[PDB]
Design a protein around this ligand. Structure first.
Ligand SMILES: c1ccc2[nH]nnc2c1
Length: 247
């Protein structure tokens, strides 16, 4: 990984040490990227709900993971499940239970630094993972992107800024998450969001993550050509908002 400081440096060490999990998957991979393109074609709003009990910015909630996933299943294009353990209070067990219990594609949301975590996502039943340009060197991103593809996954490459986007396009990303989360400060910062969306080429499926809490926000972003929307903290607090997002 890159040289890092702070809570991200802690998580990267934790990820580096994390043992490979005993698990095996119960259905073939379903491409999240392709399901997004199918929603788009059907003129259906494509929401990726996130399951997480805690977040480094302070979310703290208890909700049963299988009940949340089944509630969400009919409304979402897919689910992102936290498996990072310390700051999000997730676990691979949450992903094992969810991916065996619902039919929609699953992204395993974690800080991925090594091939064996991608093997963990595959063996736990996930269809894809995020690879974060701020964590990884360009060489490690190329290597992990190819490794994920070799398992039949198309990973989402996560970007925060223009330097990240230049790397994501150079390595041949076809699936990007644009996040407004500042890893320092841990605040939502949308100042570059519109510019970055406008710089993503036609061959790349784009998803936004930015503390979305209103249908109006999704509406405005869809007009800019965003394909799907990662929504986490608002749905963890009020799951019933899924209707407002997709009605
Ligand atoms: C990993 C996987 C998905 C993400 N969405 N925003 N930030 C992410 C990091």
């Amino acid at each position: 990984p890159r040289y890092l400081k702070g809570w991200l440096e802690d998580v990267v060490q934790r990820s580096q040490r994390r043992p490979s999990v005993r698990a095996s998957r119960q259905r073939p991979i379903i491409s999240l990227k392709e399901r997004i393109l199918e929603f788009n074609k059907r003129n259906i709003t494509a929401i990726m709900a996130v399951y997480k009990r805690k977040s480094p910015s302070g979310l703290d909630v208890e909700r049963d993971p299988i009940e949340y996933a089944k509630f969400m299943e009919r409304g979402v294009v897919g689910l992102a499940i936290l498996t990072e353990e310390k700051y999000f209070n997730g676990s691979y067990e949450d992903l094992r239970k969810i991916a065996s219990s619902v039919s929609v594609p699953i992204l395993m949301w974690d800080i991925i630094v090594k091939e064996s975590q991608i093997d963990d996502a595959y063996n736990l039943g996930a269809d894809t993972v995020g690879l974060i340009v701020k964590i990884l060197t360009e060489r490690e991103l190329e290597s992990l992107l190819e490794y994920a593809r070799s398992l039949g996954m198309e990973p989402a490459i996560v970007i925060h800024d223009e330097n990240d986007l230049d790397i994501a396009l150079r390595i041949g990303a076809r699936f990007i998450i644009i996040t407004s989360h500042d890893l320092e400060t841990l605040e939502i910062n949308n100042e570059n969001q519109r510019k970055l969306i406008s710089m993503i080429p036609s061959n790349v499926v784009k998803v936004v993550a930015s503390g979305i809490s209103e249908r109006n926000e999704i509406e405005e972003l869809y007009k800019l050509g965003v394909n799907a929307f990662e929504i986490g903290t608002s749905l963890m607090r009020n799951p019933e908002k899924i209707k407002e997002f997709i009605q």
